[PDB]
Each structure stands twice: as C-alpha cells, then as structure tokens.
Amino acid sequence: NIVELEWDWVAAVLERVFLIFFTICFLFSAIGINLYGWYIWYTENHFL
Amino acid sequence: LIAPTAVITFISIIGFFTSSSVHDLRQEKITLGITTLLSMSIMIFMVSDKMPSTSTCVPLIALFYTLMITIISVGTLAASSVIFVQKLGSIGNPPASKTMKWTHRIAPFVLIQMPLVMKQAYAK
Amino acid sequence: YFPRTFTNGPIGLANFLENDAWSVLGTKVNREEKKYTCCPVNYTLLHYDVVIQRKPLYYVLNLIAPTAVITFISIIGFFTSSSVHDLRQEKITLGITTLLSMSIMIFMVSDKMPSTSTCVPLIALFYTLMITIISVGTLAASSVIFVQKLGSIGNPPASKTMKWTHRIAPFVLIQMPLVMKQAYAK
Ligand SMILES: C[C@](C#N)(COc1cc(C#N)ccc1C(F)(F)F)NC(=O)c1ccc(SC(F)(F)F)cc1
Ligand SMILES: C[C@](C#N)(COc1cc(C#N)ccc1C(F)(F)F)NC(=O)c1ccc(SC(F)(F)F)cc1
Ligand SMILES: *[C@@H]1O[C@H](CO)[C@@H](O[C@@H]2O[C@H](CO)[C@@H](O)[C@H](O)[C@H]2NC(C)=O)[C@H](O)[C@H]1NC(C)=O
C-alpha cells in the first residue's frame, strides 16, 4: 500500500504542475491575442 | 464573441486539474471536456454566419478560438494521463525510482504538501 | 449570332476581380444551330461555359476539423478506466451526448446544400463514419462490461481465453496487477 501512496503522490504533484502550466498558457493566449489586436488597431487611427 | 468563451475556458481548466482528495481514485474528465468542446462548436457556427466565408486569410479571432479549442482538448488528455500515472501503483509494486527525489523538490514550489498518512507510512 | 472572343479566351478576364471562395479554371464558347417544334427554321444559340473550382480550406476547417476532434476525444473516454479490478460505469450517456451534437451539426451543414437525392457527397461519407464509430464504439464499451460481469455469474473461469489473453497482453502495453499475481501464487 506504500507503493500505491508513492504513485498517488506523483500524480498529485503532476496535476498541480498541469494546473499552473495551463493557467499561464490561457492568460498569454487570451490576453496576448487581444493586446496585439488592440495595438494594431491603435496605431492605425492614431498614426496612419 | 471573446468574453463569454474565455470565461468558460478558464473555469473548465480548473475543473480538469482539481481533486477533493490525494489518495482516492479520480473520475474521468472526458464528459467535462466533451460538453465544453461541443458548446464552442456551436459558438463557432454562430460566429461563422457573420463573416464573408473566404479562404484567403485566417482572422485574428480564428487564432483565439483555435487556442481555446487546443487547451481544452489537450487539457482533457493531460487530465487522463494523471489517472494513468496513479494506476501504476496497482499494476505491480515497482515504486518510483528516481521520480521520488524530483517529485519532492518540486512539491514545495507548487504549493502542495504531503498527507499525514503518507508521512506515517514513511516512518513505519 | 456569332461570338467575339478575347486574348485569354471566349470570356474576357482582364478586369475580373478574384473571388474569395471560387477559382475560374477556364471558359468555353460554342455556337450551335437548333430546331424547335414551334418554328420551321433553325435558331442560332451561343453557349458560354465557366469552370469554377472551390477553395476548400474554409470548409475543411469549419465542417470537418471540429467533428474530428470531438470524435477522437470520445473514443479515448470509451475505452479508458481508472482501475482493472473495479466495476465500470456505463458509457451510454457519453455516447448519447456525442451523438446528439453531431445531429445538430448535420442539420446546420444540411442548410448549406442543394438538398438533392442524386449523389452522396464526400463530406456525407465522413459524417457517416464518425457516427458509426461513436455508435459502434458505444456498443463495444458495453460489451466490456458484459464480459466482466461473467465473473460474478457463477464461477466458470475462462478456459482457453487465458492463454490467448496472456500472449496478447504484452503486445498491447498492459501488464497484470499485483493482486492477480498474488492470487496466482496462492
Ligand atoms: C469563426 C470562423 C473564424 N474566424 C470563420 O471562419 C473563417 C472566416 C474567414 C473570413 N472572412 C476566414 C477564415 C476562416 C477560417 F475558417 F479559416 F477560420 N471560424 C473559426 O473561428 C474557426 C476556428 C477553428 C476551427 S478548427 C478547430 F478544430 F476548432 F480548432 C474552425 C473554425
Ligand atoms: C450534410 C448532409 C450531407 N452531405 C446533407 O445531405 C445531403 C446533401 C446532398 C447535396 N447536395 C446530397 C446528399 C445528402 C445526403 F443526405 F445523402 F447525405 N447530410 C449528411 O452529412 C448526413 C450524413 C449521414 C446521415 S445518416 C447517420 F445516421 F447520421 F449516419 C445523414 C446525413
Ligand atoms: C438546322 O439544324 C439541324 C439540326 O440537326 C441541322 O442538321 C444538320 O445537318 C447537317 C447537314 O446539313 C448534318 O451534317 C448534321 O449532322 C446535322 N445535325 C446533326 C446534329 O446531326 C441542319 O443542318 C440545320 N440547318 C438547316 C436544317 O438548314
């Protein structure tokens, strides 16, 4: 049952790593695309 | 077109990688992923009716939807690989050999701590 | 009637604006004399043909990609379990939800087509395979529950399946659990 506990621990840590990795990927995707688009939109009217 | 999709995608991510216990078998997240995936498809069809239907370019919003779909679909497979890793405890009793030192060092950085039962087993 | 053709062909394209969904492969013109029952003399007709080819990227992305991803994910859910020695949950609800979504997609796509009965399009064969895999996959998942239920109903153990099951076991990367090995030794 100790072997089961050790593999439970590995899965618990791994899914915690997945939570952090997929949270940053979401933030950079949603924010990055819209911020880039706003930058293109802002330079058009204001300068060109 | 963007705000409703981001909120659903963010909420579903938390559901993929959250559990109520450390030493219990996990439930499959396939149903959660399928329901989220099927809703975004309806959103895509609805938005697609407002556009020229050209093939020359890929809009900025198309890239946003592609990333949301990829995160949900790839996130569903990542959640299933967590169940795969936990299932290795039952199949034979080869314990983790070198993963256990790496797992212990990463454990404090990602704010997760060992359960009491695991600590008791180590002392035993 | 006689036709007057241009440098590039029967129909001029020097001022043509390209279409975002179609390509003009070429043009043709034919002059033919025809008799009709209403008149004793012939008529002269000019036939202009335009050959246009669709640009597929838009339709492949919007009609095929979303369905393939959902079908692939659902397949994994059908034949995946968290344990070997525990009763499985029925996958009928998973199959029904996937099946009902594909029906909506079929209705949505069907509104974009002539509604003819002459032919079966290429995309129709793609959808038929996706439906068959999900529907047949649902029955295959239920047959796994049927086989596991044979352990409780009486205790006739597997007779010749056990040697076949052990040889196939390594090729499909699955290994025996510890309890089964302990039971065998006991
Ligand atoms: C909403 C829509 C947009 N934009 C409309 O389509 C287009 C419209 C115009 C115009 N004008 C130009 C190109 C496209 C396309 F189709 F090239 F994007 N389509 C999507 O957003 C999308 C995203 C991913 C997937 S494929 C998945 F599996 F979901 F990842 C399918 C559709
Ligand atoms: C989307 C649509 C297409 N293409 C439209 O229909 C047609 C349209 C044209 C034209 N022009 C010619 C033939 C057909 C049809 F109807 F012959 F396909 N239909 C499907 O894709 C489909 C597939 C399987 C099933 S039956 C299931 F149980 F789902 F397997 C039902 C509909
Ligand atoms: C009116 O139209 C008819 C359509 O059949 C023409 O018939 C052709 O006649 C020529 C001989 O003059 C044949 O070599 C062709 O084979 C016929 N057509 C076909 C399709 O075989 C007819 O010539 C036209 N002019 C008339 C009747 O004065």
Author numbering:
A (entry chain D): 486 to 533
B (entry chain D): 249 to 372
C (entry chain E): 187 to 372
Authors' own words:
The natural compound betaine and the recently developed synthetic compound monepantel are both anthelmintics that target the acetylcholine receptor ACR-23 and its homologs in nematodes. Collectively, these experiments confirmed that ACR-23 is a nonselective monovalent cation channel. Inspired by the construct design strategy for α7 nicotinic acetylcholine receptor, the loop between M3 and M4 of ACR-23 (residues Lys 386 to Gln 437) was replaced with thermostabilized cytochrome b562 (bRIL) to facilitate protein expression.
In the cryo-EM density map of the monepantel-bound state, blobs of density that are absent in the apo and betaine-bound state are clearly visible in the inter-subunit interfaces in the TMD, situated at the extracellular half of the membrane. These extra densities match perfectly with monepantel molecules. Formation of the monepantel binding pocket involves M2 and M3 from one subunit (referred to as M2(+) and M3(+) hereafter), M1 from the neighboring subunit (referred to as M1(-) hereafter), the M2-M3 loop, as well as the Cys-loop. The only exception is Asn 248 from M1(-), which forms hydrogen bond with monepantel. Consequently, side chains of Leu 286 and Ile 290 deviate away from the center of the pore, and eventually cause widening of constrictions at these positions and opening of the ion conduction pore. In the betaine&monepantel-bound state, these constrictions become much wider, with the smallest radius of ~3.1 Å, which is wide enough for dehydrated Na+ or K+ to pass through, as supported by MD simulations. Therefore, our betaine&monepantel-bound ACR-23 structure is likely in open state.
